[PDB]
Amino acid sequence: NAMLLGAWDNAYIAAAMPLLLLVENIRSWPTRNAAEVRPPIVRELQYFQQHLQKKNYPQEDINHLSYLLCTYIDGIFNGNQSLLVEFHRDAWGGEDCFEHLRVYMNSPKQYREVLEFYDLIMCLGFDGKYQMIEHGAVLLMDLRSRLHTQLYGQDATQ
Protein backbone atom coordinates (compact mmCIF):
# COMPACT_ATOMS: atom_id res chain seq x y z
CA ASN A 1 0.00 0.00 0.00
CA ALA A 2 2.93 2.31 0.73
CA MET A 3 3.97 2.53 -2.94
CA LEU A 4 0.64 3.79 -4.28
CA LEU A 5 0.09 6.23 -1.40
CA GLY A 6 3.71 7.40 -1.36
CA ALA A 7 3.98 7.91 -5.12
CA TRP A 8 0.73 9.84 -5.66
CA ASP A 9 2.29 13.17 -4.61
CA ASN A 10 5.54 12.50 -6.53
CA ALA A 11 5.76 15.21 -9.19
CA TYR A 12 8.38 13.19 -11.10
CA ILE A 13 6.09 10.16 -11.35
CA ALA A 14 3.05 12.28 -12.24
CA ALA A 15 4.83 13.99 -15.15
CA ALA A 16 5.64 10.58 -16.68
CA MET A 17 2.46 8.58 -15.99
CA PRO A 18 0.71 9.54 -19.26
CA LEU A 19 3.73 8.20 -21.14
CA LEU A 20 3.81 5.05 -19.01
CA LEU A 21 0.11 4.40 -19.64
CA LEU A 22 0.50 5.02 -23.37
CA VAL A 23 3.37 2.53 -23.48
CA GLU A 24 1.46 -0.14 -21.53
CA ASN A 25 -1.18 -0.04 -24.27
CA ILE A 26 1.24 -0.01 -27.24
CA ARG A 27 2.89 -3.25 -26.04
CA SER A 28 -0.21 -5.11 -27.30
CA TRP A 29 0.20 -3.51 -30.79
CA PRO A 30 1.84 -4.97 -33.91
CA THR A 31 5.49 -4.01 -34.14
CA ARG A 32 5.04 -1.86 -37.26
CA ASN A 33 2.11 -0.04 -35.63
CA ALA A 34 4.30 0.81 -32.63
CA ALA A 35 6.87 2.42 -34.93
CA GLU A 36 4.19 4.67 -36.44
CA VAL A 37 3.25 5.97 -32.97
CA ARG A 38 6.83 7.00 -32.17
CA PRO A 39 6.14 10.76 -32.72
CA PRO A 40 3.62 10.85 -29.84
CA ILE A 41 6.07 9.03 -27.57
CA VAL A 42 8.69 11.63 -28.51
CA ARG A 43 6.12 14.33 -27.70
CA GLU A 44 5.38 12.81 -24.28
CA LEU A 45 9.11 12.60 -23.55
CA GLN A 46 9.57 16.27 -24.47
CA TYR A 47 6.62 17.24 -22.27
CA PHE A 48 8.07 15.27 -19.34
CA GLN A 49 11.14 17.51 -19.45
CA GLN A 50 9.27 20.74 -20.25
CA HIS A 51 6.83 20.24 -17.37
CA LEU A 52 9.55 19.64 -14.77
CA GLN A 53 11.64 22.61 -15.94
CA LYS A 54 8.49 24.70 -15.60
CA LYS A 55 8.45 23.46 -11.98
CA ASN A 56 12.15 24.32 -11.32
CA TYR A 57 13.18 20.74 -10.61
CA PRO A 58 16.94 20.11 -10.91
CA GLN A 59 18.05 19.65 -14.51
CA GLU A 60 20.57 16.96 -13.52
CA ASP A 61 17.73 14.85 -12.12
CA ILE A 62 15.36 15.53 -15.02
CA ASN A 63 18.08 14.30 -17.38
CA HIS A 64 18.79 11.20 -15.27
CA LEU A 65 15.10 10.30 -15.02
CA SER A 66 14.58 11.00 -18.73
CA TYR A 67 17.61 8.82 -19.51
CA LEU A 68 15.92 6.03 -17.54
CA LEU A 69 12.62 6.49 -19.37
CA CYS A 70 14.29 6.16 -22.77
CA THR A 71 16.19 3.09 -21.54
CA TYR A 72 12.98 1.52 -20.20
CA ILE A 73 10.96 2.14 -23.36
CA ASP A 74 13.83 1.11 -25.66
CA GLY A 75 13.99 -2.18 -23.76
CA ILE A 76 10.27 -2.80 -24.29
CA PHE A 77 10.17 -2.54 -28.09
CA ASN A 78 13.66 -3.98 -28.72
CA GLY A 79 15.80 -6.76 -27.25
CA ASN A 80 15.67 1.58 -36.12
CA GLN A 81 15.82 4.86 -34.20
CA SER A 82 16.14 4.39 -30.44
CA LEU A 83 14.81 7.00 -28.04
CA LEU A 84 17.98 7.02 -25.93
CA VAL A 85 20.01 7.91 -29.03
CA GLU A 86 17.66 10.77 -29.94
CA PHE A 87 17.42 12.30 -26.44
CA HIS A 88 20.78 11.46 -24.81
CA ARG A 89 23.07 10.42 -27.73
CA ASP A 90 23.60 7.01 -26.12
CA ALA A 91 22.77 3.66 -27.70
CA TRP A 92 22.32 1.62 -24.52
CA GLY A 93 21.54 2.68 -20.98
CA GLY A 94 21.06 -0.66 -19.22
CA GLU A 95 24.31 -0.12 -17.28
CA ASP A 96 24.54 3.64 -16.66
CA CYS A 97 21.04 3.73 -15.14
CA PHE A 98 22.22 1.60 -12.23
CA GLU A 99 25.26 3.86 -11.78
CA HIS A 100 22.96 6.88 -11.60
CA LEU A 101 20.80 4.95 -9.12
CA ARG A 102 23.81 4.01 -6.98
CA VAL A 103 24.75 7.68 -6.54
CA TYR A 104 21.19 8.58 -5.54
CA MET A 105 21.05 5.70 -3.04
CA ASN A 106 24.19 7.20 -1.49
CA SER A 107 21.99 10.12 -0.31
CA PRO A 108 18.61 8.52 0.44
CA LYS A 109 16.70 11.34 2.18
CA GLN A 110 18.03 14.04 -0.17
CA TYR A 111 16.73 12.18 -3.25
CA ARG A 112 13.57 10.48 -2.00
CA GLU A 113 11.39 11.63 -4.91
CA VAL A 114 13.96 10.43 -7.45
CA LEU A 115 14.34 7.07 -5.70
CA GLU A 116 10.57 6.47 -5.71
CA PHE A 117 10.69 6.99 -9.49
CA TYR A 118 13.45 4.38 -9.86
CA ASP A 119 11.52 1.98 -7.60
CA LEU A 120 8.44 2.27 -9.82
CA ILE A 121 10.25 1.86 -13.16
CA MET A 122 11.95 -1.32 -11.93
CA CYS A 123 8.58 -2.43 -10.60
CA LEU A 124 7.33 -2.06 -14.20
CA GLY A 125 9.91 -4.65 -15.34
CA PHE A 126 13.09 -2.64 -16.01
CA ASP A 127 16.20 -4.81 -15.65
CA GLY A 128 18.91 -3.27 -17.89
CA LYS A 129 22.23 -5.08 -17.51
CA TYR A 130 20.75 -7.68 -15.13
CA GLN A 131 19.09 -9.34 -18.14
CA MET A 132 22.52 -10.57 -19.34
CA ILE A 133 24.32 -11.15 -16.02
CA GLU A 134 24.37 -14.63 -14.53
CA HIS A 135 22.16 -14.70 -11.43
CA GLY A 136 20.98 -11.34 -12.74
CA ALA A 137 17.45 -11.76 -11.39
CA VAL A 138 18.75 -12.57 -7.89
CA LEU A 139 20.99 -9.50 -7.98
CA LEU A 140 18.22 -7.28 -9.36
CA MET A 141 15.55 -8.54 -6.93
CA ASP A 142 18.00 -7.94 -4.08
CA LEU A 143 18.59 -4.39 -5.34
CA ARG A 144 14.84 -3.75 -5.46
CA SER A 145 14.44 -5.08 -1.91
CA ARG A 146 17.22 -2.85 -0.57
CA LEU A 147 15.68 0.22 -2.24
CA HIS A 148 12.03 -0.64 -1.51
CA THR A 149 12.78 -1.12 2.20
CA GLN A 150 14.83 2.10 2.19
CA LEU A 151 11.70 3.93 0.97
CA TYR A 152 8.73 2.06 2.44
CA GLY A 153 9.75 -0.47 5.13
CA GLN A 154 10.12 -4.21 5.57
CA ASP A 155 6.39 -4.94 5.38
CA ALA A 156 6.10 -3.27 1.96
CA THR A 157 8.88 -5.45 0.49
CA GLN A 158 7.11 -8.74 1.27
Residues of this chain that bind Ca ion (CB under 5 A): 6
For the CB of residue 58, give the shortest distance to Ca ion in the complex, in Å.
Answer: 17
Q: How many CA atoms lie within 13 A of 80 on its CB side?
A: 8
Question: Can you spell out the DSSP letters for 37-78?
Answer: THHHHHHHHHHHHHHHHHTT--HHHHHHHHHHHHHHHHHHH-
- Residue 9 assigned as binding residue: yes
For the CB of residue 65, give the shortest distance to Ca ion in the complex, in Å.
Answer: 16
Is 14 or 21 the residue whose CB approaches Ca ion more closely? 14
Is 6 or 94 the residue whose CB approaches Ca ion more closely? 6
For the CB of residue 73, give the shortest distance to Ca ion in the complex, in Å.
Answer: 24
**Any idea how long the chain is?**
158
Is 6 or 75 the residue whose CB approaches Ca ion more closely? 6
Within 8 A by CB and 6+ apart from 75, the residues are 94, 126, 127, 128
Binding residues: 6, 9, 116
